[PDB]
Amino acid sequence: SIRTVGIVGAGTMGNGIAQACAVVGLNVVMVDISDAAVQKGVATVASSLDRLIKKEKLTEADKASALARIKGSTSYDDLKATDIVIEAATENYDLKVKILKQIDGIVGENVIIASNTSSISITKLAAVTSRADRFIGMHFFNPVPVMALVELIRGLQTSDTTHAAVEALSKQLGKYPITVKNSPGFVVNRILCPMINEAFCVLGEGLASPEEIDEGMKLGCNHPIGPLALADMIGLDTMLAVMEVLYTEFADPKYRPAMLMREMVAAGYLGRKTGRGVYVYSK
Amino acid sequence: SIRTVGIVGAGTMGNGIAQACAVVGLNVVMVDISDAAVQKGVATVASSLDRLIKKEKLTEADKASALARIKGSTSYDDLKATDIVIEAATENYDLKVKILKQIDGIVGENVIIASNTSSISITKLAAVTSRADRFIGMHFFNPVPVMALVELIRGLQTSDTTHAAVEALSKQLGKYPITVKNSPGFVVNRILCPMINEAFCVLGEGLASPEEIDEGMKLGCNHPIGPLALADMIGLDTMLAVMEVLYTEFADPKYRPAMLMREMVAAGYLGRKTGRGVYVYSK
Numbered sequence A, B: 001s002i003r004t005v006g007i008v009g010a011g012t013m014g015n016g017i018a019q020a021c022a023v024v025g026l027n028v029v030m031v032d033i034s035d036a037a038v039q040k041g042v043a044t045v046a047s048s049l050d051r052l053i054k055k056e057k058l059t060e061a062d063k064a065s066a067l068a069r070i071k072g073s074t075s076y077d078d079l080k081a082t083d084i085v086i087e088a089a090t091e092n093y094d095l096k097v098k099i100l101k102q103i104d105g106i107v108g109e110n111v112i113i114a115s116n117t118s119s120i121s122i123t124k125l126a127a128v129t130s131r132a133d134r135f136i137g138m139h140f141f142n143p144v145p146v147m148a149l150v151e152l153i154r155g156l157q158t159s160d161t162t163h164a165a166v167e168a169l170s171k172q173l174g175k176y177p178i179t180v181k182n183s184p185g186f187v188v189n190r191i192l193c194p195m196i197n198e199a200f201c202v203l204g205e206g207l208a209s210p211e212e213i214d215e216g217m218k219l220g221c222n223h224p225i226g227p228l229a230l231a232d233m234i235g236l237d238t239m240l241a242v243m244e245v246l247y248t249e250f251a252d253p254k255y256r257p258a259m260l261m262r263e264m265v266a267a268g269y270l271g272r273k274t275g276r277g278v279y280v281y282s283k
């Protein structure tokens, strides 16, 4: 049984997960490095909950009822309390390793250790823990409370039992889990991101205007957002880096980053987060 | 002014266009090779119109009012009547050429000749007519009455005037036109179809189940349909052929068809149209 979920990292993704567990009545032990980071974690869960109140989504008593289940710590031994720990602090490799080893040292042999990540090899991480068969990848989606799926990524070592447990936890949290063998871009980024890249290739070659490329794809394929606009939301620096990973990990030019993508990144035109990428934004 | 539109071909796409012109009060001269094909063209416009009646979309009098404007011929000299002729009979090259030359012979020098096509080089076709600057590509979308966009594809020769006229005609028909320099896959198929191909690559490599790949993309990127399901609707034979065109026309393995795609095609598992492709269907 998994009634208590360890969480390391209390940022966007961390509360994300904590909330998702808590509104289901699971006990979360959320760990960060200050008291500032922890409570600030608790503020966005409160604020988010307060938004749900205000559009007739259940309810005042549950807002209260979820939060009680969140034990927000700063010491790391609190995770002996826990059925499973999810790391969710960093896309930095060396740092990620450290965190997982520290986690590996505290919790008992049979506890499952997961790591949220978009790009990092789940197999390589699993190998740094003393029980690799108890390790598995998760990838949650970027507004976590509402987004109804998770990629569950098996390292080469991830056992079937580790898999079914997390698979069930995910279904519990009310998400549809997707199982994927560890592979660059897993499933989602693997197919989506080279499409974004092809849009840049089209824009790069002068074939059409951006706006028209984007309308092409909205109206033609009934995509909610156009790939260029979407790139501007994700971050072209985030896009370029995914493509560089595909190209490096596969060692195959099929995944060349688009050149215009490289140029915008070099220039600092990174999308909405700098006010300019493919399109210009208001600031 | 463009008040009378030539149409060669009275199949799915042909009526498609005719209707779209007629419900706007444009005079269509629709030409096919039998009287069977012509009237059968007129039947699907009637049937489609009768569906619109039945969901409170205007109206009995307009159903009547559109049809009057459709002059359905079988002789080819009827197209001297016309401001512009759109070919819409065939994706066969040699045949396409013939039709356009025949059309080129009838109509006057200043009449615009277009060709609907997903894959055929608009430049190469424009070159077979005596006035290439009066030639342009269209690509309409596959349920034409409702689909609100057209790709407008300039051959190297297409003049600006030819372009603006058709651009305006398109806006008239109530569609958003997309302008594209002639290039394999234009814009839409160029970015969409290699994404479908990447899904097959993922399925091909054993990374995930189809259903999960498809859910990955629906829920993750809010795509209406999943790429594999979509491939099953388009036809895997139609998919493979688009990829083969990309690979052949660019002469670049970046667009390798996925191997699983090749195998399903070789096997006859072509999607919904044979009852089996990626998934199995009821027949």
Ligand SMILES: NC(=O)c1ccc[n+]([C@@H]2O[C@H](COP(=O)([O-])OP(=O)(O)OC[C@H]3O[C@@H](n4cnc5c(N)ncnc54)[C@H](O)[C@@H]3O)[C@@H](O)[C@H]2O)c1
Pocket: A008, A009, A010, A011, A012, A013, A014, A031, A032, A033, A037, A088, A089, A090, A091, A092, A099, A116, A117, A118, A139, A140, A142
């Ligand atoms: N946000 C995204 O774009 C995104 C998308 C998919 C996956 N991810 C994954 O999730 C991770 C977390 O991203 P986020 O959006 O929550 O970041 P964020 O900037 O919102 O917050 C990161 C949090 O991690 C904490 N942290 C850093 N080092 C730590 C340590 N040694 N121990 C405990 N906590 C530590 C920080 O104090 C901070 O509160 C990413 O690094 C990435 O691996 C992120």
Ligand SMILES: NC(=O)c1ccc[n+]([C@@H]2O[C@H](COP(=O)([O-])OP(=O)(O)OC[C@H]3O[C@@H](n4cnc5c(N)ncnc54)[C@H](O)[C@@H]3O)[C@@H](O)[C@H]2O)c1
Pocket: B008, B009, B010, B011, B012, B013, B014, B031, B032, B033, B037, B088, B089, B090, B091, B092, B099, B116, B117, B118, B139, B140, B142
């Ligand atoms: N349907 C699609 O999947 C699709 C999608 C995009 C573009 N297109 C383009 O549009 C073309 C038409 O496809 P469709 O779906 O209307 O086909 P269809 O099978 O519904 O009908 C084709 C029609 O063209 C007519 N035709 C054939 N040869 C002719 C000639 N020499 N003169 C006059 N008419 C002739 C036939 O009699 C028939 O009525 C395709 O070949 C392709 O170039 C098709």
